């Protein structure tokens, strides 16, 4: 096989090298705001990169959400929320030094990390109305403070709530004052979350505090043939109908025996010479892996 | 307890910083205050440094005239006056937000104060 | 926007008496937010009352508090001449957290 992070059609891949899908949509800041690539022919993942989401934190449904973006083959990131203009009431500056970025401090680009003006957070009912009549990738967070301090001097409440409303999907956080150990130098983590919109629905955002508000949001054409690839290989640029995570394929044979996760208008894999799950999946793992197993016999007959 | 820098005397214009550093507690937790006093008179809220996050905040009296920071390997915080004149000769606390439920925004302990001083 | 006035400015007392002074907030600060702290003689003050009622450690239980809204209360059931000293109110309503300019015993 070819070797190399060909093109399948022209159309070029996404390159987040050492961001990750956690990181890249929520905006990492050691990550290009990616607008240069709003549409590919499939993302590149590297087995375990680093600087993912720059704040420690649970990412809820993340096995989901890569999955429903592997099909996604382009956004319209637009700020669903303008930085100012939206929160004349808060404090939208609020930076990490666990996001540093060229610089002491920082926070993602896809949220913000809302926080007290005049040392008052006041109960916010934000929402908006998915008028472009396209899917829209929600993503906010809920801050889980490592004391009350941090809590009440960031939101000033200590019993706060968050809540997301939309027709079909209601969920509603009580944030726990938990003193995690250390990660990437931050105790305290960012549970964060992301729905789909759809067309004409209206997404209602509360919260007495502890909201890590959206700022631009994913307004994504659902498109086919795409998928995250993972693998570590060079970019140079390349061509052929189908690739595979260490090269692309031109056809000489509709058989493949390179790695299972693959793009395109791509042969059938066989061993004779990308969805995911967390724990708590196994069955559904082994559902997959079998799923897989069984039609990898079949194509070797 | 909080420890603190030394008594400072200084022309107009010249800025100046004041430390206070902590023990017997853990730094990070707990958030700073600094505060004004002059001789015999009112003390005021400068503002608060949240040393776990960096989340600034002033009082607007002081908000640009005053700037607070943190260091958490020193367990220390510090307090920059810039465009000093004459009635910022008084004596600067540091102080901490202890954590209550239910409760909050005391101050439960002080540094011994500085006499920054102006003359 | 907040700030609050207390009085008396100055009292004069006797050892082994009993005493209320008031802290009164131009606009409203919840019982849960206002605090009094003991001031002596140019040193570092020291937090006296945590909860409109609640007591420190270090104060005996002479010190209490009540009150609510705009208007709050704290009280001595004995003042001694060497345990007395300027009384500081301070409170939440927003930042800035602006305290009362102290009261002051001459006891």
């Known amino acids: 096989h070819n070797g190399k992070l060909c093109l399948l059609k022209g159309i070029a891949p996404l390159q987040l090298g050492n961001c990750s899908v956690a990181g890249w949509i929520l905006g990492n800041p050691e990550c290009e705001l990616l607008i240069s690539r709003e549409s590919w022919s499939y993302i590149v993942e590297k087995p375990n990169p680093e600087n993912g989401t720059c704040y420690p934190g649970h990412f809820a449904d993340y096995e989901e959400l890569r999955e429903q973006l592997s099909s996604v083959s382009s956004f319209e990131r637009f700020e669903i929320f303008p930085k100012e203009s939206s929160w004349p009431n808060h404090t939208t500056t609020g930076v990490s030094a666990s996001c540093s970025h060229n610089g002491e401090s920082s926070f993602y680009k896809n949220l913000l990390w809302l926080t007290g003006k005049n040392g008052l957070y006041p109960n916010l009912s934000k929402s908006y109305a998915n008028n472009k009549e396209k899917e829209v990738l929600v993503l906010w967070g809920v801050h889980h403070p490592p004391n009350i301090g941090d809590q009440r001097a960031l939101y000033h409440t200590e019993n706060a709530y968050v809540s997301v409303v939309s027709s079909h999907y209601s969920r509603k956080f009580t944030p726990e004052i938990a003193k995690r150990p250390k990660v990437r130098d931050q105790e305290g983590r960012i549970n964060y979350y992301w729905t789909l919109l759809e067309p004409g629905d209206t997404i209602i955002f509360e919260a007495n505090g502890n909201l890590i508000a959206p700022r631009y949001a994913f307004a994504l054409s659902r498109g086919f043939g795409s998928g995250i690839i993972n693998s570590n290989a060079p970019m140079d640029e390349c061509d052929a109908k189908c690739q595979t995570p260490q090269g692309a394929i031109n056809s000489s044979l509709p058989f493949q025996n390179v790695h299972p996760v693959t793009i395109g208008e791509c042969p059938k894999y066989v061993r004779s010479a990308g969805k995911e799950f967390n724990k708590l999946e196994r069955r559904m793992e082994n559902l997959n892996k079998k799923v897989d197993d069984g039609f990898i016999d079949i194509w070797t007959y | 307890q909080l420890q603190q820098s030394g008594p400072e005397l200084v022309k107009p214009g010249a800025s100046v910083k004041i430390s206070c550093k902590a023990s017997?507690?853990?730094?990070?937790?707990?958030?700073m205050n600094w505060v004004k006093q002059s001789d015999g008179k009112s003390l005021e809220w400068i503002g608060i440094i949240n040393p776990n996050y960096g989340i600034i905040s002033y009082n607007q009296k002081f908000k640009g005239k005053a700037t607070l920071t943190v260091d958490q390997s020193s367990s220390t915080a510090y307090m920059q006056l810039n465009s000093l004149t004459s009635e910022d000769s008084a004596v600067y606390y540091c102080?901490?937000?202890?954590?209550?439920?239910?409760?909050?925004?005391?101050?439960?302990?002080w540094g011994k104060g500085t006499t920054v001083t102006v003359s | 926007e907040n700030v609050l006035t207390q009085s008396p400015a100055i009292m004069s007392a006797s050892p082994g008496e009993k005493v209320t002074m008031t802290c009164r907030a131009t606009?409203?600060?919840?019982?849960?937010?206002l605090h009094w702290y003991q001031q002596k003689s140019g040193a570092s003050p020291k937090l006296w009352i945590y909860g409109t009622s609640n007591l420190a450690s270090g104060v005996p239980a002479r010190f209490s508090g009540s009150g609510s809204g705009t208007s709050y209360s704290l009280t001595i059931s004995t003042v001694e001449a060497e345990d007395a000293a300027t009384y500081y109110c301070?409170?939440?309503?927003?930042?800035?957290?602006?305290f009362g300019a102290g009261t002051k015993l001459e006891l």
């Open positions: 606009s409203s600060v919840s019982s849960s937010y």
């Open positions: 102080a901490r937000w202890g954590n209550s439920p239910y409760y909050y925004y005391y101050m439960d302990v």
């Open positions: 017997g507690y853990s730094f990070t937790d707990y958030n």
């Open positions: 301070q409170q939440y309503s927003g930042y800035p957290l602006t």
